[PDB]
Amino acid sequence: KIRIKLRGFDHKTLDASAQKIVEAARRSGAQVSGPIPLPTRVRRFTVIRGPFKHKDSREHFELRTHNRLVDIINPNRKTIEQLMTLDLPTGVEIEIKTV
Amino acid sequence: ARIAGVEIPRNKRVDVALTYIYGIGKARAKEALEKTGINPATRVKDLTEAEVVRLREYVENTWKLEGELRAEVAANIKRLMDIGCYRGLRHRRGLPVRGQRTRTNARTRKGPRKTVAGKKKAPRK
Amino acid sequence: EQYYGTGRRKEAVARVFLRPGNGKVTVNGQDFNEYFQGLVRAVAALEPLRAVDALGRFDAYITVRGGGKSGQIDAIKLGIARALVQYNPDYRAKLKPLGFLTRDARVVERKKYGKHKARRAPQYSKR
Amino acid sequence: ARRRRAEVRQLQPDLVYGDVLVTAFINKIMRDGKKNLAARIFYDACKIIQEKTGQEPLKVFKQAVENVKPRMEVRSRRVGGANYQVPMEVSPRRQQSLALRWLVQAANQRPERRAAVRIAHELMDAAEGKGGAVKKKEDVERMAEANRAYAHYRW
Amino acid sequence: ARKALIEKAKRTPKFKVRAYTRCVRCGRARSVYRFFGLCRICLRELAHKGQLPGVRKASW
Amino acid sequence: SLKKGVFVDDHLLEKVLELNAKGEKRLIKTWSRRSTIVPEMVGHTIAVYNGKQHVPVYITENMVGHKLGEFAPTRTYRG
RNA sequence: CCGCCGUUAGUUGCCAGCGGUUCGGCCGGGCACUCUAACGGGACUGCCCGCGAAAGCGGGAGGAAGGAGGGGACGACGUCUGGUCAGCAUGGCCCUUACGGCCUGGGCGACACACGUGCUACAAUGCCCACUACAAAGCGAUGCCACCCGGCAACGGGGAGCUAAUCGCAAAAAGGUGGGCCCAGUUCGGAUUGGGGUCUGCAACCCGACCCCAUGAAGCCGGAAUCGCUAGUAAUCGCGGAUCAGCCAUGC
């Protein structure tokens, strides 16, 4: 019944936040449907290499937003307690809901 | 089979056939070809008075064509050529009222581009 | 019961189920010979069943999403290949020399900044 | 090239009979990349040939293609500040290919209105020889056997 | 003029249709990728100098 | 274009409707040229700006509800 | 990034396998398959044979992958006082109630020609109206805007869902499947032209896009010359994003 989405720019750590949760949650309760990866939406940007009227000569840059999704079963007090308390995203965005 | 302005289309499907007349494009044509009967597909070939004559009645009683239609144009052109507006200004100057291109193109509106002389060019090399 | 293969070509993909029966084939709904009433490559894609002349013994059921009509066709071929090269890899012996597994290439390449179709370049002046 | 002798790359092993010849023809007929459309035009032409003439399609195909297939052409060579109209025998593939082209543009020359008509007509009268494509064949054969003074004056 | 121009829009005048974006890390309106509130040269100086998250010297 | 309505401006309005309180002097001095010509201006010496100076244009009928600053040239020099 | 396989993982996908159904993944169920997006393995002339002293080359196979697999970012030492003081900083010279600042107007769109990159074309492998098809990527909260309705339309009034793999932009188009045109300045091509409409915005004259219906030029496939492109490349066809009230975007 739990809808936890994790939006991330560093896919390395962002995934590390995806399985971690699942351990202690599969631990402090019952099943926790696997972290399931979700379409890393990417915002395409680009511009030219310099300042002066140089139509060619360009560099592309884009935003890598990886989506994560954890579903847990019927929650428990330990689970909810620690796994709403402890964290260290240091940036990464954590948004949950009751669907 | 003169209808208006001595205009007879001859062998050709009635739609495009009457389309061959000024004052009538695809719309006003097919429109007429319902509001006076007449099958759009069926050619001008085996036509028959009543419906041809009445097509012609639909032409004039409803809207105008040819001479007056262009007289209207030119007279309101005179409306642009009675004060001296930009429209009329460049209507005289041989130029379009769209303020777009007067630098290069617009040769649709003042004959072939008749060479100046080149005037000799800057440091182009 | 199930003799399945995977198809995928020119950015498209076909879930190639093949059971047996009368060897008649229909895919993604509509009858095969109406789904693709365009390109002649149609029957050509069904070459592997015509490689052993067993065109009508194995019942295929394919799910091809993406690419185009022809791309679909490509992935279909790919799978009909892979499926008979599973539930009888005896058919693999005489199908690679025939080239029924080399997947694909093709990509309308990443458009080159500066040129058009990543190759197509603007008319060069010099002057 | 210069450090290489290049690549040939197989043509479509035909989806109809199986003849690469047919797909080469189809391709030359094809315009703007829609292989299927023009291919259809050809096939229509074919079934017409075999609802009209006796001998089967690929037969008419071979007798026409053969009734072009030019061997000795002209090319060019270096001479200080001039040119050598070098008559030379052509590689079989080049012969056959350009020949196919000549079938196509022979369908071009025509005052024909529909495509299948042009292609069919040509394949018929060129299986025969009554065509501008064979005319230009023996024309490049004049060119060859009329610049033949440049026999061993090849590049 | 320049200095006065940034101030012109910095304080929203009369009509909605007289605002124009401004590179607050260089100071112009031309090609200011509004998403970042940065011009194109300001954009590249930021992303390059490592002072811009979420990006990537893209290689797709 | 105003789809439902016709754009004009109130400078002219207040002005015209106050000389209409009598029918006085044969001059008005307007700076707006974006405005649509109206028939209640009667149409004497509507002195409009151009880009360099105010240049009086006459107004009667056929300039009905079409824009003012159109009978003020601006685009000087011809061809 | 892209092609083959794997393990984690299952609100994308599905009878693939079962139940039912408003038979429309629609209702339960399931991770098989697509997919998603992660962590690796996989290709080195490694194997086989003939040649070369070797470097390499020929032929064949194993394999999704051959001999650098396709692409991308990647660009030295250096030149060229290249380009840029109008993005920025910047040494100096310089106006300082004027070269500073605001406002409203007007130009940056002007026209006797010339030129580069371009869109469209000049036509039956085509133009036109009807039915069905397969796209990939990128978007959308004071924005995406399906729906009925008013309007032929431009779009407007009431109105669903949507911090999106679940809602909408959105119809891909050519393909295919029917019917029309019959070789013609043509149902070609719309360049331009008039009397009216929609939308944004204080405001659409200069100088906006878009709608209507009437206008319907040149254009019969381009001389000297000259450009592109070596594989899913060219040619053809549609699609999005950037910035943006709007839109001159046929540009990128």
How many other CB atoms are there within 10 angstroms of residue E16's CB atom?
7
If you ran DSSP here, which 8-state letter would residue D148 be given? G
Helix (H) or strand (E) holding D77: strand D77-79
Contact criterion met (CB below 8 Å) for A44 and A61: no
From the list D16, D137, D106, D124, the residue with the least C-alpha distance to D60 is D124
Number of domains in chain E: 1
The residue assigned the tokens 């290499």 is A49
Number of domains in chain B: 2
If you ran DSSP here, which 8-state letter would residue A93 be given? E
Q: Which amino acid is at B124?
A: R
Q: How many CA atoms lie within 13 A of D74 on its CB side?
A: 19
- Helices D57-66, D115-128: axis angle to 10 degrees equals 60
- Helices B26-35, B49-62: axis angle to 10 degrees equals 120
Chain A nearest C-alpha distance from C83 (Å): 29
- Looking at C5-76, which runs of residues are DSSP E strands? 5-7, 13-18, 25-27, 60-65
Token couple for D77 = 């060579």
Token couple for D128 = 């025969």
Token couple for C11 = 């950015």
Round to whole Å and give the CA distance between F8 and F1: 11
Contact criterion met (CB below 8 Å) for F69 and F33: yes
Q: How far apart are the first and last CA of chain E?
A: 41
Task: Find the residue closest to G175 using CA and C1' atoms.
Answer: C38
Contact criterion met (CB below 8 Å) for A87 and A24: no
Bridge partners of A68, per DSSP, are A6, A37
From the list C49, C51, D123, the residue with the least C-alpha distance to C62 is C49
Token couple for F11 = 């400078």
From the list B84, B102, B104, B82, the residue with the least C-alpha distance to B94 is B102
Contact criterion met (CB below 8 Å) for B89 and B33: no
**Ordered alpha helix ranges (H), F1-79:** 10-19
With residues binned 3-state (H G I as helix, E B as strand, rest as coil), the percentages for chain D, rounded to 5, are 55, 10, 35
Q: Are B14 and B36 members of one domain?
A: yes
Residue B102 lies in a domain: yes
Nucleotide nearest to E34 (CA to C1'): G243
Bridge partners of C15, per DSSP, are C6, C63
- For residue E3, give its domain range: 1-60
3-state secondary structure of F43: coil
Which residues, including other chains, have CB under 8 Å from residue B89's CB and lie 6 or more apart?
F73, F75
Contact criterion met (CB below 8 Å) for D107 and D98: no
Round to whole Å and give the CA distance between C117 and D30: 21
Contact criterion met (CB below 8 Å) for B13 and B43: yes
How many other CB atoms are there within 10 angstroms of residue C43's CB atom?
15
Token couple for A34 = 């696997």
Round to whole Å and give the CA distance between F40 and B64: 33
Bridge partners of A94, per DSSP, are A6
Distance of CA F65 to the CA centre of its chain: 11
Round to whole Å and give the CA distance between B23 and B58: 12
CATH number for the domain harbouring residue D49: 1.10.455.10
- For residue B98, give its domain range: 72-118
If you ran DSSP here, which 8-state letter would residue B13 be given? B
CATH number for the domain harbouring residue B40: 1.10.8.50
Q: How many CA atoms lie within 13 A of C44 on its CB side?
A: 17
From the list F21, F19, F41, the residue with the least C-alpha distance to F32 is F41
Contact criterion met (CB below 8 Å) for C4 and C83: yes
Nearest-5° Cα angle at D128, D122 to D130 = 65
3-state secondary structure of A5: strand
Q: Which nucleotides of G are covered by protein (CB under 7 A)?
A: 1-5, 8-11, 13-17, 33-39, 60-66, 69-74, 82-84, 87-89, 100-107, 109-118, 124-126, 133-139, 164-166, 172-177, 180-183, 186-187, 191-195, 197-209, 212-217, 226-236, 241-245, 248, 252
Round to whole Å and give the CA distance between B36 and B26: 15
Residues counted in chain D: 155
**Which chain C residue has its CA at the smallest distance from A58's CA?**
C113
**Ordered alpha helix ranges (H), chain C:** 32-35, 41-45, 69-84
From the list B14, B16, B21, B20, the residue with the least C-alpha distance to B36 is B14
The CA–CA distances, whole Å, from D127 to B27, B113, C126, D49, D63 equal: 51, 52, 49, 11, 5
The CA–CA distances, whole Å, from E60 to A38, A41, A56 equal: 19, 14, 18
Do the chains contact at B85 and F79, CB–CB below 8 Å?
A: no
Region of residue D96 (phi > 0: left; psi between -120 and 50: alpha; otherwise: beta): alpha
If you ran DSSP here, which 8-state letter would residue E11 be given? T
Contact criterion met (CB below 8 Å) for D95 and D33: no
Q: Is F55 exposed, middle or buried (0-12, 13-18, 19+ CB in 10 A)?
A: middle
Contact criterion met (CB below 8 Å) for A79 and A72: yes
3-state secondary structure of D60: helix
Contact criterion met (CB below 8 Å) for E10 and E21: no
Round to whole Å and give the CA distance between D137 and D51: 29
Do the chains contact at D15 and C38, CB–CB below 8 Å?
A: no
- φ and ψ at C99, to 5 degrees? 85, 40
Contact criterion met (CB below 8 Å) for E60 and C110: yes
Which residues, including other chains, have CB under 8 Å from residue C121's CB and lie 6 or more apart?
C114, C115
- For residue F64, give its domain range: 1-79
Token couple for C106 = 């093709």
3-state secondary structure of D72: strand
The residue assigned the tokens 């005179």 is B78
- For residue A28, give its domain range: 1-99
Round to whole Å and give the CA distance between B107 and C1: 75
Nucleotide nearest to B75 (CA to C1'): G194
Q: How far apart are the first and last CA of chain B?
A: 66
Answer whether any strand G atom is within 7 A of the Cβ of A39: yes
CATH number for the domain harbouring residue E50: 4.10.830.10
Token couple for D73 = 């052409």
Token couple for F5 = 């309505």
Q: Is F34 exposed, middle or buried (0-12, 13-18, 19+ CB in 10 A)?
A: exposed
- For residue C51, give its domain range: 1-127
Round to whole Å and give the CA distance between B64 and B59: 7
Strands F55-57 and F46-48: antiparallel
Q: Give the per-residue SS3 of D14-52.
A: CCCCCCHHHHHHHHHHCCCCCHHHHHHHHHHHHHHHHHH
Q: What is the resolution of this structure in A?
A: 3.5
CATH number for the domain harbouring residue C79: 3.30.230.10
Round to whole Å and give the CA distance between B11 and B26: 17
For A9-74, give the DSSP string: S-HHHHHHHHHHHHHHHHHSSS-EE---EEEEEEEEEEEESSSSS-SS-EEEEEEEEEEEEEEESS
Round to whole Å and give the CA distance between F60 and B20: 41
For A15-32, give the DSSP string: HHHHHHHHHHHHHSSS-E
How many other CB atoms are there within 10 angstroms of residue C45's CB atom?
24
Which residues, including other chains, have CB under 8 Å from residue D143's CB and lie 6 or more apart?
D73, D74, D85, D87
Q: How many CA atoms lie within 13 A of B97 on its CB side?
A: 12
Q: Are B3 and B48 members of one domain?
A: yes
Contact criterion met (CB below 8 Å) for A18 and A67: no
Solving technique: X-ray
Contact criterion met (CB below 8 Å) for D99 and D70: yes
Round to whole Å and give the CA distance between B59 and B9: 15
- φ and ψ at A58, to 5 degrees? -135, 155
Number of domains in chain A: 1
Bridge partners of A38, per DSSP, are A67
Find the Å distance, CA of residue F51 to C1' of nucleotide G51: 89
Round to whole Å and give the CA distance between D150 and D144: 9
Chain B residues 2 to 61 with C-beta below 7 Å from nucleic strand G: 12-13, 16, 19-29, 41, 43
Contact criterion met (CB below 8 Å) for D77 and D64: no
CATH number for the domain harbouring residue A9: 3.30.70.600
